[PDB]
Design a protein around this ligand. Sequence first.
Ligand code: MET
Ligand SMILES: [Zn+2]
Length: 544
Amino acid sequence: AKKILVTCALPYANGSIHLGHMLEHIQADVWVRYQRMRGHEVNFICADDAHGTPIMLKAQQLGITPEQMIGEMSQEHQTDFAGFNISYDNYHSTHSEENRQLSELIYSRLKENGFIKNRTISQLYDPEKGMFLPDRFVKGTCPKCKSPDQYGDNCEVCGATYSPTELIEPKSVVSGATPVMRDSEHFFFDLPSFSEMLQAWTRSGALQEQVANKMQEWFESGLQQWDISRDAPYFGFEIPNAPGKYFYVWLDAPIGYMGSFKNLCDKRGDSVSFDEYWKKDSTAELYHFIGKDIVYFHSLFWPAMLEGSNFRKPSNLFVHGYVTVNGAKMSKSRGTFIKASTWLNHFDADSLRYYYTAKLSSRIDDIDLNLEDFVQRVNADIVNKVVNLASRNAGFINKRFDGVLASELADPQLYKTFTDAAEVIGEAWESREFGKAVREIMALADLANRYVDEQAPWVVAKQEGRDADLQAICSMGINLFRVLMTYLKPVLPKLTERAEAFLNTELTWDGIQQPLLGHKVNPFKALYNRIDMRQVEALVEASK
Ligand code: MET
Ligand SMILES: [Zn+2]
């Protein structure tokens, strides 16, 4: 049995969970659930990313402490993820004592090992508020076209890009004061020292080909030292021996993966597992599910930080593309920027889990939630292919056979075709070829419904003396359903619970080798109802 630690990217504490987050957390959860079904020791770890200037300023605007604000959003996030049945073993915070101690430890080791440099830089500073301004907190007049009220390093009228130091009549977004250039000592992590190590990782064949190709572009451009400090005022961890300096959020954020695992171990009273998973000699596997926009941090800075502080590196990064809705980036004006909480007011979690899983693969590709296709595909595949095998057969079993399935399989050869597919389906889940797994499962569902059609139970049921035939046919259909629901168990947790209640058995991967024979099933009310476009229209309207 493998030991596996899986993470999803840590959501920022200053925004609600939306469908883009859900693509990532669902992808990881399906994989995790499959790994658990195969008997491995799995630790699925996440946390909120709770530090930084935007969070500090948002709390001040609200008139509450950053601690109060991040606590409220942590609860909101966890409520939403729980509503999608994301099965974390721990959900922590980057604002935690575990992360503080690990961040200080890693920094101290990097510094002792020669990988931290000090250099003075010049940056725009708000002298009224008394703080350095990140680019997006500077506004002013575009130097090229002279359009007013442009933010940061680009103009939204003419498209020009420039340093915010080129803005005409610049103003602080925080206070309205004119910012000025001011010097400050910063601490830099010497990423270039790890170039050769990182290039060897890129060539090893572990990473997605598309990621390795992108890393070659980054090596070609040239790795640079990374500014890992920020001046007070800041919401984050103060740097030891450097009063008024804090770790930049992105230094502490991936350390939060470690902090969340440490927290889990400590709450369990487990004094051995942290080192077993994070020491250089670990035989455990470490996987990060992440999106395209944060690959640089996870493929360059993070393995280098770990190497330089005597910790093991990720076994692999699993990168996914962006979500689109109706083919386009989510759009607030069109009502396609959809929050996870809003989704659940209109649809169940399983429907979105299924739809995303049917489109996901081991490559980086944007995943399109086409809302018309969502209705058609959920209805066709879940209602009319898979659940249909239970719903068309269970009534006869309950009403005419006292709930008891036949004592032998009617078609053992067909059953073996279903169980023989377990190897290819499992390998598809394992390899993250989720769309392939779904295609194989739905091809089997088509075969199962073809079998039932060929036996014509709606004819058999009306014909004198054919009770045994009817029980045989319907039991066969229910056994095929048992197998398909096992293959779909990582994808559809709530439907699976309903199926397990009907079948009076827990679904296990190996259990499909023993069909249900001479076995009592329970009645059910609909396992899964149809959806329609009126519900989609309501979701979109509610999201505007
Ligand atoms: C250590 S992963 C941090 C991810 C970051 N909060 C983001 O949402 O992009
Ligand atoms: Zn302009």
